Design a binder for this molecule. Structure first.
Ligand SMILES: Cc1cc2nc3c(=O)[nH]c(=O)nc-3n(C[C@H](O)[C@H](O)[C@H](O)COP(=O)(O)OP(=O)(O)OC[C@H]3O[C@@H](n4cnc5c(N)ncnc54)[C@H](O)[C@@H]3O)c2cc1C
Ligand SMILES: Cc1cc2nc3c(=O)[nH]c(=O)nc-3n(C[C@H](O)[C@H](O)[C@H](O)COP(=O)(O)OP(=O)(O)OC[C@H]3O[C@@H](n4cnc5c(N)ncnc54)[C@H](O)[C@@H]3O)c2cc1C
Ligand SMILES: COc1nc(C)nc(NC(=O)NS(=O)(=O)c2ccccc2Cl)n1
Ligand SMILES: COc1nc(C)nc(NC(=O)NS(=O)(=O)c2ccccc2Cl)n1
Ligand SMILES: Cc1ncc(CNC(C)CS)c(N)n1
Ligand SMILES: Cc1ncc(CN)c(N)n1
Ligand SMILES: [K+]
Ligand SMILES: [K+]
Ligand SMILES: [Mg+2]
Ligand SMILES: [Mg+2]
Lengths: 583, 595
C-alpha cells in the first residue's frame, strides 16, 4: 500500500498527480464545483496555468499545445456550463485523434441527480466524443482514475478523455492507504517489391512517433516511392524532395490524385481514408483494385486501430500497430529500387501540367489570397526561426495547406475531422505555450476568427506573441463556394458584418496592421513576422475566389475541376447577373 | 393523406412548416450539411433571420427571444461543430424551462456511423439536455417530427428539443403522399385535480401565517400575475419570488416580500422559515432557494405534523412533485389555471395584523444594506443598479433586463424594482456566463420597441463579446452595462469566505471595453467618478442605437445577505460595515497586497 497521499485533499492529490504525469501546463477556467482543486493548485510551482476567456478557448488551446508538443493537453473547468463549453473541443480532439485530458468539476455526490445548481450529466454528454470518461466516486480512487485517463488518452490512437470530479470528492481528505503482425509485414514487403507504380498515402499517424518522418523518408528513398499526404499529414514529408506528390483529396493537387488513381499499390500509412480524401468511394483507387484482383498489388494499411481497418475500403494487407514501429521492422525486407523511369516520368508530366494554378494579381486588382500564402511562406522561412502554423476553417485553410512549403513535422495545426471554425487563435496560443521560441502564425478567415476572437486578450495575459493573419474576403468563403457551384449563386446568410479588426486588436492590447494594396503587401508581411509581441495583420483579399482543384459529389479523384482563367471570368459575370451586382 | 407537399424538397417543406408553426424569427449559422435548408429559406419573407458570430450566440439569442415573447426560440445550425456549439444553450434552456426548437444539419444518412466529415452523434450528446430529440430518417416524416418538436417544446414545463436533419433528407424531394395528421400542428382526472384544489383551499383557509412562494411557472400563462395578485389580495398572503419569478409580482405592493434564497432578503427568508403554510406556485425548490433542506421551513413542517398547515405545490411536471421536500398537497397542471379554479373556494380575509406586523419589523430591520460611496471611493455596484432602475423605469418605456452570471446578476435581482412580467431574463439553473449580451439581442428582436438592458459582469461579458457586431448587424439597439470589478466576483467572494482569501485564477485581463465597442460599431462610454454617474446613465439610456457603458466599480465586495453551507434560510450573514473593513485588511495581508 501507499500512504504518500494520506492526509491530503482530493485537490492536493490532483496537484501532485500533475507533477507525476509530467504535466507542465494546465488550461482552465474556475467555478464553484471545481474550487477545491483550484485552491490546491493556487500558486502551484508544479506547472504553469493558462486562463482563457471562454472554456472553448481552453479546449482548443490544449489541442494546439498537444499538437505542437506531443504531450497531452490538460483542461480543468467547472461543472455545468464549464463542462458543456468544452464539448466542441472534445469532439474536435476525438475526430483528429488528439491527446487531451479534460477535468470537469461536478456537484457533490449527494447532489447528483437532483437538478442541482450548475449540474449536467457530463459523462453522458461526452460519451460519444471521448475515448473514455468516468466520474470519480471517492478520493481513494482519484490517483487511479487520473492514471488511467492519461494512459488511455496517449495510447493506441491518441484521443480525449474526461474525468468528472464531484466537489465533495476533491474536498475530501484521504484517510486510508491506497494500493502474427510479422506475417502481415512479410507479405507487405513482398507486395511492395512487386509494385510497378506504388504510392505512399501518408497521414497523421506517422506523426505520432518521433521517428515517423525519418523512417518514412527512409522507405521512400529505399524503394523510390512517391509520397502524398493528407491535410493532417502535411509536414511529415519534405515537400522540397522530388518524390513529394503534395496533398491529395477533395482539394489536393491533380498529380497526387491522379497518381493515387493510377497506382497499382497504395501504401496507406497512418491515414483513415476519410471522405475528404477518397472522393467517390466506388471510384477510389481503380488501378489498385485491378492489381488486387490480379494479385499483383492493391492496398496495404499500417493502422493502429483495428476498427479503422477495412472500415471504408477493403484492403489486401493489414499491418496492425504503430506505423513507425512496423515500418522499421519491414525496412530490411524491402529491396533497394534503382529507379522508376516510367512512373516518375508520368508523375512529372502531371506536375508540369497540373500545378496549383489560380488567377494572379493584375494592375489595380485586389490582393489574391493564394499569393499572400506563398509570400508569407517565404518571408517566414527567411526568419530562420522554427515556424508553426495554425488556421481557421475554410478556403484560407485549404490555400494555406496547398501553397505553403511543408518540411517540418508538427508545424501544421489545423482542424480537419470536425473542422471547427475559431480553432486558429486558441490553437496558436496553445502551440506558442508549447514552443515559446517558435514563430507561431495563425492563418485565419474573417468568419472563423469572429468565432473565438475574444481570446486575443488571453494571448496578452498568457504572454504568447502569436501572429494573427486574417485573409478577409468578408464572407464564409468555403460555403459561398458551394453555393456558387451547387446552388446557383444563392448566398443564403453567408456574409457576416465584420468589426474593425485593427481597432479590435488594439482594444485587445495587440498591434494591428492592415493591407489593401498590392504594393504594400511585401512590407506589411515583413513587419508582421518581425514584430516582437502579439500582432494582427488583416489583408483585404479578393472575394468569391474558389479553391481548386476540387473533387465533390460523385466525382472520382481523377474527375476533378481545375483552374481556368476564362471560366473564372465567366463565373464572375454570371454571379453579378444573378446577384444583381451585389456579389 | 396529404399530397400538397409532393414535389417539394425537405428544405422547402421545412420553410413551409415554419409559417404553419407561426415562426417569425430564426437564429442560425449556415454550414454544409444544412445547406439544403438554407437554400430553401433564401430571401424567405416568412420570417426574420438573425446571424450571430458563434452558434452559442444563436442559442442564447433564441432563449432571450423565448423569454421575452413566450414563443419558442428557433435555432438552425449545421452538423458537427455547429451542433456541439449549441449544447450549452440547450443545457441552459433545459435547466430554466425555456421553449426552444434546435434544428441541426447532419451528414447524409448513408454516411452516419462512418466518422464522416463534420459528423457528431448529436442525438446522443443532447439526450440529457433536451426534453426530447430525434433524427429525421426520411423526408416523409419531416412534417411529423417538426410538429412533435414544437408541441413538446411548448407544453408541460417548456424546454428545448433537438431535430437532427440529414443532408440527404433535406435535399430529397417528397415523392409520396403523407398523412394529413402529420402535417397539422379525462373526467376522472379533472375531478381529481378539483379534489386537490378543494383540499388546497381548505388548508389555505386554515392558515394564520401563510406565504406565497412564487417562481417562473406563474409566468407561463398571460393571466398568471393577475390571478396571483387576486389570491394575494383576497386571502392577504404576502408574496416572495425566486430569481426566476421576479417581475410576476409588483414589488411596490405592501404584501411583496422581495426575493428569497441564498441571496434573498432576510424578510423573505424569515417569513418562509416562520410560515405555517407555504404555497409554492411554479417553483421547484432548487438548492439556491431552500438553504439547508433539513432546516427549511420548520414552522410549516410543524404545522403539517399538527395537521394545520405545511406545503401546497402548484406544479405542472410530475418529475418535480415531492422531489425535494414532502408536500401535503400537490395541485397538478398549469398553476394559473388552477389558481383560477380555486379562487371562489378561498375565504376572503379582512386582515393579518400580527403576521404583517412581524413582517414589517423584519423589513425595517433587514434592508439590502451595503457599503455606500464615500469621498474618493470607487463607485459601488449596488448603487449603479439602484440608480439605473430609476432612470430606466422613469423613461416610461417597456424595460427588459438581461444579465450575465455572478454578483452583478444578484445585485440586479436585489436592487432593481421589479413590477412587470417577462422583464427579467437571466440564467439561473445552469448559470451560464456570457448569457447577457446574446439574450439581450434575442429579447430585443422579440420586442423591438422595448428598452433592453444587459447588466453584465466583466468576466461574463468576455465569454461572448464577439456578438457585439451581431447586435449592429441585427439592428438591435441593446444597452450593454458592464459593472467592471476586474474579477470573477462570485468566485472571489467564495474564495474570500471559504478559502481564506486565496484567489486562484479568478482575475482575467480585460480588453479596453470602450475601444472594443467602437471597433464593433457601437457607441462606447465609460464612468469612473461618482460625480459623473448620473449623467452617464442618462446618456446611456437615451442613446438611440446600440451602446456600451462600462462602470468601474469597487472590488471584492460581497453580495449579502448570504445563506450557504449547512446554514438554514434564517441563519444568514448580514452586512456589517465594521466587518467589511476588517475583512478588507485581512485580505490585503493574506494576498501579499495583490488584492
Ligand atoms: C474545409 C476542409 C477541407 C478539407 N479538405 C481536405 C482535402 O482536400 N484533403 C485532405 O487530405 N483532407 C482534407 N480535410 C481534412 C479531412 O477532413 C481529414 O481530417 C484528414 O484527411 C484526415 O487525415 P488523416 O487520415 O491523415 O488523419 P486522422 O484523421 O487523424 O486519421 C489518422 C489515421 O491514422 C491512424 N493512426 C494514428 N496514430 C497512429 C500510429 N501511431 N500508428 C499507426 N496508425 C496510426 C488512426 O487511428 C487513423 O485511422 C479537410 C477538412 C476541412 C475542415
Ligand atoms: C449566482 C447565482 C445565484 C443565485 N441565487 C439565487 C437566490 O438567492 N434566490 C433564488 O431564488 N434563486 C437564485 N438562483 C437561481 C436559481 O439557481 C434557480 O434558477 C431559480 O431559483 C429557479 O427558480 P424557479 O423555481 O422559480 O424557476 P424554474 O427553475 O424554472 O422552475 C419552475 C418550476 O415551476 C414549474 N412550472 C413551470 N411552468 C409551469 C406552469 N405553467 N404551471 C405550474 N407549474 C409550472 C416547473 O416545471 C418547475 O418545477 C441563483 C443563480 C445563480 C446563477
Ligand atoms: C452562487 O452560488 C455559488 N457560487 C460559487 C462561486 N460557488 C458555489 N458553490 C457551491 O454552492 N458549492 S456546493 O458545493 O455546496 C454545491 C451545492 C449544490 C449544487 C452544486 C454545488 Cl457546487 N456556489
Ligand atoms: C469543405 O467541404 C465542404 N464544404 C461545404 C461548405 N459543404 C460540404 N458539403 C458536403 O461535403 N456535403 S456531402 O453532403 O456530400 C457530405 C458527404 C460526407 C460527409 C458529410 C457531408 Cl456534409 N463540404
Ligand atoms: C464552429 C463552426 N460552425 C459552423 C461551421 C460551418 N461551416 C463552414 C466551413 C462555414 S460558415 C464550422 N465549420 N464550424
Ligand atoms: C460558462 C461558465 N463558466 C464558468 C462559470 C463559473 N463561475 C460559469 N458560471 N459559466
Ligand atoms: K505545398
Ligand atoms: K427589489
Ligand atoms: Mg472568409
Ligand atoms: Mg466581474
Amino acid at each position: 500500500m501507499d500512504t504518500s497521499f494520506v492526509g491530503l485533499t482530493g485537490g492536493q492529490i490532483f496537484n501532485e498527480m500533475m507533477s507525476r504525469q509530467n504535466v507542465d501546463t494546465v488550461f482552465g477556467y474556475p467555478g464553484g464545483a471545481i474550487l477545491p482543486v483550484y485552491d490546491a493548485i493556487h500558486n502551484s510551482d508544479k506547472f504553469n496555468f493558462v486562463l482563457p476567456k471562454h472554456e472553448q478557448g481552453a479546449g482548443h488551446m490544449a489541442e494546439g499545445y498537444a499538437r505542437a508538443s506531443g504531450k497531452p493537453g490538460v483542461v480543468l473547468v467547472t461543472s455545468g456550463p464549464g463542462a458543456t463549453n468544452v464539448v466542441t473541443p472534445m469532439a474536435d480532439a476525438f475526430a483528429d485523434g488528439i491527446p487531451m485530458v479534460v477535468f470537469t468539476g461536478q456537484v457533490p455526490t449527494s447532489a447528483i441527480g437532483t437538478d442541482a445548481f450548475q449540474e449536467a450529466d457530463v459523462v453522458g454528454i461526452s460519451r460519444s466524443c471521448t475515448k473514455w470518461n468516468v466520474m470519480v466516486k471517492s478520493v481513494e480512487e482519484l490517483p487511479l482514475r487520473i492514471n488511467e485517463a492519461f494512459e488511455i488518452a496517449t495510447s493506441g490512437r491518441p484521443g480525449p478523455v474526461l474525468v468528472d470530479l464531484p466537489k465533495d470528492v476533491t474536498a475530501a481528505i484521504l484517510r486510508n492507504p491506497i494500493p502474427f503482425v510479422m506475417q502481415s509485414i512479410n507479405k507487405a514487403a513482398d507486395l511492395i517489391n512487386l509494385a510497378k507504380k506504388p504510392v505512399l498515402y501518408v497521414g497523421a499517424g506517422i506523426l505520432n512517433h518521433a521517428d515517423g518522418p525519418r523512417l518514412l523518408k527512409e522507405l521512400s528513398d529505399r524503394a523510390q516511392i512517391p509520397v502524398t499526404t493528407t491535410l493532417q499529414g502535411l509536414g511529415s514529408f519534405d515537400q522540397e524532395d522530388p518524390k513529394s506528390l503534395d496533398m491529395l483529396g477533395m482539394h489536393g493537387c491533380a498529380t497526387a490524385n491522379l497518381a493515387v488513381q493510377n497506382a497499382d499499390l497504395i501504401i496507406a500509412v497512418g491515414a483513415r481514408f476519410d471522405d475528404r480524401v477518397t472522393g467517390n468511394i466506388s471510384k477510389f483507387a481503380p488501378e489498385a483494385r485491378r492489381a488486387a484482383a490480379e494479385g499483383r498489388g492493391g492496398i496495404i494499411h499500417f493502422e493502429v486501430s483495428p476498427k479503422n481497418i477495412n472500415k471504408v475500403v477493403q484492403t489486401q494487407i493489414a499491418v496492425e500497430g504503430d506505423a513507425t514501429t512496423n515500418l522499421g521492422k519491414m525496412m530490411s525486407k524491402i529491396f533497394p529500387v534503382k529507379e522508376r523511369s516510367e512512373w516518375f516520368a508520368q508523375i512529372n508530366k502531371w506536375k508540369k501540367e497540373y500545378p496549383y494554378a489560380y488567377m494572379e494579381e493584375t494592375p489595380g486588382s485586389k490582393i489574391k489570397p493564394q499569393t499572400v500564402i506563398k509570400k508569407l511562406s517565404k518571408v517566414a522561412n527567411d526568419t530562420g526561426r522554427h515556424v508553426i502554423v495554425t488556421t481557421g476553417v475554410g478556403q484560407h485553410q485549404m490555400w494555406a495547406a496547398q501553397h505553403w512549403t511543408w518540411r517540418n513535422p508538427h508545424t501544421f495545426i489545423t482542424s480537419g475531422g470536425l473542422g471547427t471554425m475559431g480553432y486558429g487563435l486558441p490553437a496558436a496560443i496553445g502551440a506558442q505555450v508549447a514552443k515559446p521560441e517558435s514563430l507561431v502564425i495563425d492563418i485565419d478567415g474573417d468568419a472563423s476568427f469572429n468565432m473565438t476572437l475574444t481570446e486575443l486578450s488571453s494571448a496578452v495575459q498568457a504572454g504568447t506573441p502569436v501572429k494573427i493573419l486574417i485573409l478577409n474576403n468578408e464572407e464564409q468563403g468555403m460555403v459561398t463556394q458551394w453555393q456558387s457551384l451547387f446552388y446557383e449563386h444563392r448566398y443564403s446568410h453567408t456574409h457576416q458584418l465584420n468589426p474593425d479588426f485593427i481597432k479590435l486588436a488594439e482594444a485587445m492590447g495587440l498591434k494591428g496592421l492592415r493591407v489593401k494594396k498590392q504594393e504594400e503587401l511585401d512590407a506589411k508581411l515583413k513587419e508582421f513576422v518581425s514584430t516582437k509581441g502579439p500582432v494582427l495583420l488583416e489583408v483585404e483579399v479578393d472575394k468569391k475566389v474558389p479553391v481548386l482543384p476540387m473533387v465533390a459529389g460523385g466525382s472520382g479523384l481523377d474527375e476533378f475541376i481545375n483552374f481556368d482563367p476564362e471560366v473564372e471570368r465567366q463565373q464572375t459575370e454570371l454571379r453579378h447577373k444573378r446577384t444583381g451586382g451585389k456579389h
